[PDB]
Amino acid sequence: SLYGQQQAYAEPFIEMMDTNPEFRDKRSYMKNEHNLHDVLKKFGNNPILNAIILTRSNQVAMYCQPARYSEKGLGFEVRLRDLDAEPGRKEKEEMKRIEDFIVNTGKDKDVDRDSFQTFCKKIVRDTYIYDQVNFEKVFNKNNKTKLEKFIAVDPSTIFYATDKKGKIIKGGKRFVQVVDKRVVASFTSRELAMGIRNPRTELSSSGYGLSEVEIAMKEFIAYNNTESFNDRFFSHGGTTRGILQIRSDQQQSQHALENFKREWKSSLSGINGSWQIPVVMADDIKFVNMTPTANDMQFEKWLNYLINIISALYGIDPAEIGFPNRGGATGEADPGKKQQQSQNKGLQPLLRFIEDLVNRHIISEYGDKYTFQFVGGDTKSATDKLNILKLETQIFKTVNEAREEQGKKPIEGGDIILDASFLQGTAQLQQDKQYNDGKQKERLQMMMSL
Amino acid sequence: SLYGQQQAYAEPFIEMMDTNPEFRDKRSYMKNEHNLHDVLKKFGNNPILNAIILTRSNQVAMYCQPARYSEKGLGFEVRLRDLDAEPGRKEKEEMKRIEDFIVNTGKDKDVDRDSFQTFCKKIVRDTYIYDQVNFEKVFNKNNKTKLEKFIAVDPSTIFYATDKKGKIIKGGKRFVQVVDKRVVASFTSRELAMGIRNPRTELSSSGYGLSEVEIAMKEFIAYNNTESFNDRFFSHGGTTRGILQIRSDQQQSQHALENFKREWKSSLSGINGSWQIPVVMADDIKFVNMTPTANDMQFEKWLNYLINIISALYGIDPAEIGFPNRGGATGSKGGGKKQQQSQNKGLQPLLRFIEDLVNRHIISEYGDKYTFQFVGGDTKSATDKLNILKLETQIFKTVNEAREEQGKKPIEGGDIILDASFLQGTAQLQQDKQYNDGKQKERLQMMMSL
């Protein structure tokens, strides 16, 4: 079973003829092809796809540092799940250790290992080429329970392992690594993550993703063709403006024509000849125009159309990558702005996907009490914090509580709210005390008299 | 019966010739087709349809996490139905357990199981391809009453089961799974959900949905044809600008013409030849133009029109997906309001549909006291909460009640509202008390004197 024991079938009921009994082939949507990722790998140098991958991964890279150490507060943090909990002395250190582990991408620091930044850039590129992310988790050899490293692995080499009965293996070696169409390694679900953004219920999809490169492939071909078309004007074309037809009773001999070419170039070529006019006394002279007087690129609208569609599949603004956004007219609790809508639509899903992968696979080694999240900045300058506390000191905080939150010594005459009504209250209660004191003393004096 | 015992017929009275006695065929609206879902499956790779499915499912994916743990408040929550109730100590834990179950998509955590995010993306894709969502509910083997997992199922495999009398089964195994036109599984209403967005009263609709892909199918075909037309200029066309007609008493031999081609390319081709002009002394020379001097894509308006219709059926702005908008040329205005309206107009129906499905099928296992809802954020920052409490402390709250809500010890001189009128009242009442004390003591002393 793919997920677990179920009475509904989740895989093709009849075993399709995979080339190998041991793993499920990555069939194209129409099953016209069985090695789809070897097709898609050919597009990894596409300039548009690479512009998207680079812009997205550059945006992502800003979060990669811990917010804890980043004075602007931008980055990620590891936090307790419950907002109501106060972390214990050991929990704060364990969270700092997990943060450090993530930063180093492993237990010890080692310059030979990817940083978290390099890891994230890798898996972003892999998502947008293959729609398949894999990274291996390597546990300590002496203690299988102790994680030491996680490293991203080439997704084109990772396949679901299949039983001889054509069923996908669960609980065992769920995954195999295949090179030259032989299995070179195998992994359990414990040892290898797989992440997919575009899941399908389709039985024959066999749990694999769905690349936008597959969907947009016709568009990519059309784009490539129009680029080659426009370039071949110079590379292969005839740029010749026209033919100068000179006509007489008989064609000139080749010798005559070649010394006429010499008179021409010696009299009219370059800057030196540039404004002279030839006089020619042929019987008739005609010039046939074979090209437009002013050439420019063709099919520009076609290009914009194609690129707009590809951008809509990837969820990016064409104008963010130097193209017209067809239709223009750009579309929160914050007073945000139109562009931020595009930023958000592009950015939060990818970050959330990465968060999901990290939470499921790494933090889960430390148990569910912790959470990994990326966090944006805050609008909490000294001015804003002082305004907030200026209200809390009216509503809640005595001077000394405020000072204590700063670590500043309490002062005699603190422990009061800074409101005149509070003082009128305390002056009332003081008078009340002095009155009750008088009343009780005179009562006592009368009782002693009686 | 389809719904229940009723005297109005809800199904075709005469049994239509279904291919199999055991299940109801998914006939097309006109009954022109009996295998409708195998028709629609061919469109699941359409770039427009996939752009819509991906944008919608990316929008939905943000809500999958619990709001409880999300400091911005965005996500979902499990809640008591009544807003007036206060949850008991055990109810809070039961709600947390149900939330955890939903997040994990099952009782235990298991990296091999779909997350809720993957489930939602799946069922969104299924709604927008088939207008049919199915997921199986798996109960504990020892206790059939205890739910363990829910898993999304391929909607193309799920059919209504029919009695030998051609009536749809109720109370029994209402559903069957059919693969290769044999029944591989069966389900009760307890074990399988079905969700439909586009219901019909039409008797022959037999309880199935209605995909927008079926309605728009002509438009999709026209789209495909216009795309092929525009692409075939490069793939198959003659791009040849024109014919250079040279004419003389007799055509040149092939040898002469081929060494004329050699003179031509050796003198005029590429950048190297780019600005030279040939002189030719044929009797007459003509150039016949066969194409426009400037080619571009054709039928662009037709494309915009088609995609506008498809977007209007799906309820999405074409500008959201990279097309000019005509239905709202110059956008729309009145009611950030433009963004808010467009976003919610797309998103809220699908979210409400998922909520309804979850409430009916999952939460109902725990009884009607609870509800599952997606919840947006709120503008309830510390600033807003402090403003609110700054009013409540004038209207309701003494300093000490506020401090208690913070868990901070009450202070002598609290128990007062921070309004000067309240203190002026209490200052009056104190004097009133001192007067009544004097009056009563002097009354008693006078009575004792008399």
UniProtKB/TrEMBL annotation, chain B:
<keyword id="KW-1162">Viral penetration into host cytoplasm</keyword>
<keyword id="KW-0118">Viral capsid assembly</keyword>
<keyword id="KW-1171">Viral genome ejection through host cell envelope</keyword>
<keyword id="KW-1160">Virus entry into host cell</keyword>
<protein>
    <submittedName>
        <fullName>Portal protein</fullName>
    </submittedName>
</protein>
<feature type="binding site">
    <location>
        <position position="263"/>
    </location>
    <ligand>
        <name>Zn(2+)</name>
    </ligand>
</feature>
<keyword id="KW-0231">Viral genome packaging</keyword>
<keyword id="KW-1188">Viral release from host cell</keyword>
<keyword id="KW-0862">Zinc</keyword>
<feature type="region of interest" description="Disordered">
    <location>
        <begin position="327"/>
        <end position="345"/>
    </location>
</feature>
<keyword id="KW-0479">Metal-binding</keyword>
